Amino acid sequence: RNGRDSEAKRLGVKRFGGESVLAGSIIVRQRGTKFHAGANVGCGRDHTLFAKADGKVKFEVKGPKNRKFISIEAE
Amino acid sequence: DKKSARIRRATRARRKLQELGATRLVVHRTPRHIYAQVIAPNGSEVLVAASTVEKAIAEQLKYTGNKDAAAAVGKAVAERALEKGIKDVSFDRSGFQYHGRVQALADAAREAGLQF
Amino acid sequence: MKKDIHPKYEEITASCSCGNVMKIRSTVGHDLNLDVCSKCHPFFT
Amino acid sequence: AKLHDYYKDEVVKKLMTEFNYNSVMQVPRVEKITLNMGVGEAIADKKLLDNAAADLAAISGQKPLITKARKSVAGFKIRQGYPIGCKVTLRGERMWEFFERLITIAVPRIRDFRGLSAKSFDGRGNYSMGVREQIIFPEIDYDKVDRVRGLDITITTTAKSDEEGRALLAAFDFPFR
Amino acid sequence: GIREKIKLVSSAGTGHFYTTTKNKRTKPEKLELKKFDPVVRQHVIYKEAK
Amino acid sequence: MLQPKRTKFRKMHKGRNRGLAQGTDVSFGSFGLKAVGRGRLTARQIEAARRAMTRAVKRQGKIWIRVFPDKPITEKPLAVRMGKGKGNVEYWVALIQPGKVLYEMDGVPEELAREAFKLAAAKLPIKTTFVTKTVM
Amino acid sequence: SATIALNKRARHEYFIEEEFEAGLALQGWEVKSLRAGKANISDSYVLLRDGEAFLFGANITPMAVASTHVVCDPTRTRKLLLNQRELDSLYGRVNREGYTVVALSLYWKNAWCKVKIGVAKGKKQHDKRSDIKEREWQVDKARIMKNAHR
RNA sequence: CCGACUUACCAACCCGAUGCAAACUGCGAAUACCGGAGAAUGUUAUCACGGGAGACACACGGCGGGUGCUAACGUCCGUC
RNA sequence: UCCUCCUAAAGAGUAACGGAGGAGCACGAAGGUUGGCUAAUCCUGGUCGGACAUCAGGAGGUUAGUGCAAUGGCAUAAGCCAGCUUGACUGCGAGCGUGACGGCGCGAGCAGGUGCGAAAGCAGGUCAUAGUGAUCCGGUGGUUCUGAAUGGAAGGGCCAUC
RNA sequence: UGCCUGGCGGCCGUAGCGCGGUGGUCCCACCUGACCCCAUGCCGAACUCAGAAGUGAAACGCCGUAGCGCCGAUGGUAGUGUGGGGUCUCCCCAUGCGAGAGUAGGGAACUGCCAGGCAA
RNA sequence: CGCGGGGUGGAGCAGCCUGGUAGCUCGUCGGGCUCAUAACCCGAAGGUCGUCGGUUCAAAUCCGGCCCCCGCAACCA
RNA sequence: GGGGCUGAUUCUGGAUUCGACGGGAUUUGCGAAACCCAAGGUGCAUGCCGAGGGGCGGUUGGCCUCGUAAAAAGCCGCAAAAAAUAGUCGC
Incomplete structure (x- = not known):
């Protein structure tokens, strides 16, 4: 009455901190909103944070509740 | 509480202005005063700030904190804004409903020659 | 405060028939003369 | 504004000499009475509330107001979003004359009057009163009506303690039995 | 399943239509939404079909 | 018999009995029996050790049992092949690490309690030692 | 319709005058066995003391067994839900040495x-012979009557 | 019956103390993994393209586990 | 067959007749925008009404809710209410993640063109992750694109679709 | 500049609560009044406008308060990388990283800009 | 997939067509009826004709539809 | 031993045993138990000691009673507690 399991969706992080990528490259696949938009980072329909422009990916924690932010410095 | 309940409404407006890197146009309402400031996208340095709490500007008006006082300082802060070449702004609601005194303040800035 | 959904009004002038007059704004209907006043209301004896 | 002028001069100088109020805002003030008639049994028929609103229809400016269900209860055969009762939130100027229509002339119209409770409080200093019926109001002529629907009225003042609000009640002829 | 597909044809003379779903049992009324017609390059009303 | 009520999961993994005990020393009573061997204590072993331990005092004092099984162990039925899912529940053992205080007693002299835990140790599978109340 | 076993033999033995449609309280195993499950009704009578009118003779056994722990007996004095109008009048015309309340169906x-x-x-x-005679007396009377027209 | 006193004890809240959890986490490594910088060394070890394949029955040992009795020269994965 | 958690050893991914569960839909609005508001559960008191209705008062804090299973989320609410609408629009789409492939997903922005809001802005569906079958075959509308000696027509191609 | 307040932030619990004193000159809040601007599943509560008589009650701010939350060592310990060993379902040694938790304690914030008030 | 008709009192069947001026009986209640019931006798009740429009002086009728009951050969994704 | 089926007519949500019975609440008549106020009556009484308790013994951890000691009321086993406690059929 078991053994029925789904197939993995390949979630997680695609580019880490200090990595420079072009616009439209997917940064992080996630279900919830653990990583939020910083600078030059937009949020998709399914919480897919995508690179709006060029530059390096920065992982930062800001805010009153200290939410995680993904920001791109255009370098 | 009416103060901080209004503030969280304005937080949605303030997120869009700083994420897009756009200069905002903030306001603040008082039963007897009115306030309007121009704030740089840095978020901690304010460029142009003219209000009816100023003694040199409220003395030209009878009552401070009504539609005639908001329209007086709406034109006054806009002339100082165009002296710096500022032409790109967005009117922050600051939680207040855009019907009356806050609206009539912004039309005075539209009257002086600033579009937003 | 809001508009038009608070139970209706009808101005009358009333007076109790015991030597006491209570003439106020009210929302009864056409008019009414009261029968018992607070002065004759038995909470003393 | 009949007893409000009585409140502003007589009661205000009474209260500040009563609890030693060193501030003019420190004296509690009556602000709202909440007139609610939870008839309740209008789950199947609408006219048990519409006529209840029509029996309620004689207080403030205009058309009557009904309520909605707070949540779903199996015990009284109700679900979520149900017109169950009718309520009134009367704060401001128009609610002052309602006191004279309730505490001065409706009290002699009480069937078998003995005395009002003095231990019916919200804890903060706000009283809640209850009437068995509706005939004590002069509005109902007892001819076209068909019900004996009572209605809980809760007076919510700006009181800090219960006896401080009771001192306001004592200044407004409360029959403490 | 009980919600079935329909054909949402425009009010204009073009044969272009939309294909979406409505519940005929739940909603006996039809849909009239001013969509975009690519042939007219404008907005016209759209009526249901079979 | 010791048994959990409304367990979150009926079946659980085998796991690894690794590490040391997270129970420090004597806290409740005055004299304790701290386990030294590494192994698992079934629910039937504890009660059988409880009866022999309580036999010496016959009612006296209170015996603070600081352990609990809270771990069902499955056993496949006899003469069935491997696989075909997981076996049902048969008994409940306690993951016991070395240095774990098993039973605490109080209100009795230490001389009488010495045989009371030692007789419990014979029914217990694991090797244990008598310990006193800790200082500081 | 939804009728269960009826005491038709009671009509031969008793000549019941007035009827009632009172309801019967019964346990959880009784309801399942009542639709089907072999409920019998023979020798059904009552044992009133104050308001305790009980259906006495009613043998209904659980077909599919639904009995655990505490006992479950197929024959019980099941409590009848009787109206108060129908209750006080049975302190009278049932205590006459021969009067009883039986369940027909x-x-x-x-x-x-x-x-x-x-x-x-x-x-x-002694009057049982008359009724069996009378039932045959009604049939044979028209047999004589039809012979005038043959 | 009154019911006063008493009671092992069965008993929720609240707090203190004590343990357990793969499907509990307010904590949190080691390594692993990704990206950037640098020198050393490596008959390019890298990627791409074209031709030709075989192969898709693995086994044990070490480690991390499921399963089995932490039973199997047992089974099923990851890893060397 | 697909989706969710664990197994799975902190990248992704990873099997068993391993351990827990869900889906073969639903909404024309439950959509979009604009504006507004913020739960659970208690005790305080009050006509029916009491443990469970209606109302007011405070604690409390999102244990509430999110059409539906779990997980990750969400008050800047993704929760709730009201206003007006159809962006649940078309042609594209740099660039990416995902697979042996077929295939799937994200995507700023361009043009046409629409709605909301004064406006920056947002909408090319629903908080996200299941709610579904390739090709062939044939049905329907559109399109001369082709149409066999020519003229049409038949029949196909293409586009929309069953 | 100093003392203040208000507007906007950085960082976001050492930054948050409880509790005790504080202020109305300027400012801010309460308020006053409301046909009309306008608000509304209700009555100028909130929302909205017109005024400011009165108050610092409440809010807010400051100060005190560790009564709590919070941050937090050194060391020790768990765990682990790699290399060997054993009574190799678990451990030891070599070396590398080093917790969590607790303890000593730290701490009831700090910082940037603009405008009016009073002292300079 | 598109071919054959009918939908009317609570019920089952006609009037419609060959236009205008809706009934029948089954089930009901009203009475008779009766040592008792009933056999049986009569009294009464009910749908504007499935729905919506058009033609027609005149629509239940006729015609346009739409909906329902089906019956049918199709049925090679 | 395993698999499937069925498990009160609704077989997928709206059980309303038409009933004394068990339970709560409301209205209603008001009672030291559904209460307190020494006030209207109202001067010599109350409580603890002593003190016995219907016919027998006991009896409220406390009583109708006792001006310093043997009689008087509720109640417990005792005892006036009844019987074809539905029909119908028999020697």
Whole structure:
């Protein structure tokens, strides 16, 4: 009455901190909103944070509740 | 509480202005005063700030904190804004409903020659 | 405060028939003369 | 504004000499009475509330107001979003004359009057009163009506303690039995 | 399943239509939404079909 | 018999009995029996050790049992092949690490309690030692 | 319809005058066995003391066994849900040495056990011969009457 | 019956103390993994393209586990 | 067959007749925008009304809710209410993640063109992750694109679709 | 500049609560009044406008308060990388990283800009 | 997939067509009826004709539809 | 031993045993138990000691009673507690 399991969706992080990528490259696949938009980072329909422009990916924690932010410095 | 309940409404407006890197146009309402400031996208340095709490500007008006006082300082802060070449702004609601005194303040800035 | 959904009004002038007059704004209907006043209301004896 | 002028001069100088109020805002003030008639049994028929609103229809400016269900209860055969009762939130100027229509002339119209409770409080200093019926109001002529629907009225003042609000009640002829 | 597909044809003379779903049992009324017609390059009303 | 009520999961993994005990020393009573061997204590072993331990005092004092099984162990039925899912529940053992205080007693002299835990140790599978109340 | 086993033999032995449609309270295993499950009704009577009118003779056994722990007996004095109008009048015309309340039939009223109960009077055997004669007397009378027209 | 006193004890809240959890986490490594910088060394070890394949029955040992009795020269994965 | 958690050893991914569960839909609005508001559960008191209705008062804090299973989320609410609408629009789409492939997903922005809001802005569906079958075959509308000696027509191609 | 307040931030619990004193000159809040601007599943509560008589009650701010939350060592310990060993379902040694938790304690914030008030 | 008709009192069947001026009986209640019931006798009740429009002086009728009951050969994704 | 089926007529949500019975609440008549106020009556009484308790013994951890000691009321086993406690059929 078991053994029925789904197939993995390949979630997680695609580019880490200090990595420079072009616009439209997917940064992080996630279900919830653990990583939020910083600078030059937009949020998709399914919480897919995508690179709006060029530059390096920065992982930062800001805010009153200290939410995680993904920001791109255009370098 | 009416103060901080209004503030969280304005937080949605303030997120869009700083994420897009756009200069905002903030306001603040008082039963007897009115306030309007121009704030740089840095978020901690304010460029142009003219209000009816100023003694040199409220003395030209009878009552401070009504539609005639908001329209007086709406034109006054806009002339100082165009002296710096500022032409790109967005009117922050600051939680207040855009019907009356806050609206009539912004039309005075539209009257002086600033579009937003 | 809001508009038009608070139970209706009808101005009358009333007076109790015991030597006491209570003439106020009210929302009864056409008019009414009261029968018992607070002065004759038995909470003393 | 009949007893409000009585409140502003007589009661205000009474209260500040009563609890030693060193501030003019420190004296509690009556602000709202909440007139609610939870008839309740209008789950199947609408006219048990519409006529209840029509029996309620004689207080403030205009058309009557009904309520909605707070949540779903199996015990009284109700679900979520149900017109169950009718309520009134009367704060401001128009609610002052309602006191004279309730505490001065409706009290002699009480069937078998003995005395009002003095231990019916919200804890903060706000009283809640209850009437068995509706005939004590002069509005109902007892001819076209068909019900004996009572209605809980809760007076919510700006009181800090219960006896401080009771001192306001004592200044407004409360029959403490 | 009980919600079935329909054909949402425009009010204009073009044969272009939309294909979406409505519940005929739940909603006996039809849909009239001013969509975009690519042939007219404008907005016209759209009526249901079979 | 010791048994959990409304367990979150009926079946659980085998796991690894690794590490040391997270129970420090004597806290409740005055004299304790701290386990030294590494192994698992079934629910039937504890009660059988409880009866022999309580036999010496016959009612006296209170015996603070600081352990609990809270771990069902499955056993496949006899003469069935491997696989075909997981076996049902048969008994409940306690993951016991070395240095774990098993039973605490109080209100009795230490001389009488010495045989009371030692007789419990014979029914217990694991090797244990008598310990006193800790200082500081 | 939803009728259950009926005491038709009671009509031969008793000459019941007035009837009732009082309901019967019954346990959880009784309801399942009542639709089907071999409920018997023979020798059904009452044992009133104050308001305790009980259907006495009613053998209903659990077909599919639904009995655990505490006991479950197929024959019980099941409590009848009787109206108060129908209750005080049975301090009178049932205590006459021969008067009793019997159940003619058992049935349902929209998934509720309502039992048709009636106040029996009881026939002695000397008048039992007359009734069996009378039933044959009615049939043979028209046989003589039809012979005028042959 | 009154019911006063008493009671092992069965008993929720609240707090203190004590343990357990793969499907509990307010904590949190080691390594692993990704990206950037640098020198050393590596008959390019890298990627791409074209031709030709075989192969898709693995086994044990070490480690991390499921399963089995932490039973199997047992089974099923990851890893060397 | 697909989706969710664990197994799975902190990248992704990873099997068993391993351990827990869900889906073969639903909404024309439950959509979009604009504006507004913020739960659970208690005790305080009050006509029916009491443990469970209606109302007011405070604690409390999102244990509430999110059409539906779990997980990750969400008050800047993704929760709730009201206003007006159809962006649940078309042609594209740099660039990416995902697979042996077929295939799937994200995507700023361009043009046409629409709605909301004064406006920056947002909408090319629903908080996200299941709610579904390739090709062939044939049905329907559109499109001369082709149409066999020519003229049409038949029949196909293409586009929309069953 | 100093003392203040208000507007906007950085960082976001050492930054948050409880509790005790504080202020109305300027400012801010309460308020006053409201046909009309306008608000509303209700009555100028909130929302909205017109005024400011009165108050610092409440809010807010400051100060005190560790009564709590919070941050937090050194060391020790768990765990682990790699290399060997054993009574190799678990451990030891070599070396590398080093917790969590607790303890000593730290701490009831700090910082940037603009405008009016009073002292300079 | 598109071919054959009918939908009318609570019920089952006609009037419609060959236009205008809706009934029948089954089930009901009203009475008779009766040592008792009933056999049986009569009294009464009910749908504007499935729905919506058009033609027609005149629509239940006729015609346009739409909906329902089906019956049918199709049925090679 | 395993698999499937069925498990009160609704077989997928709206049980309303038409009933004394068990339970709560409301209205209603008001009672030291559904209460307190020494006030209207109202001067010599109350409580603890002593003190016995219907016919027998006991009896409220406390009583109708006792001006310093043997009689008087509720109640417990005792005892006036009844019987074809539905019909119908028999020697």
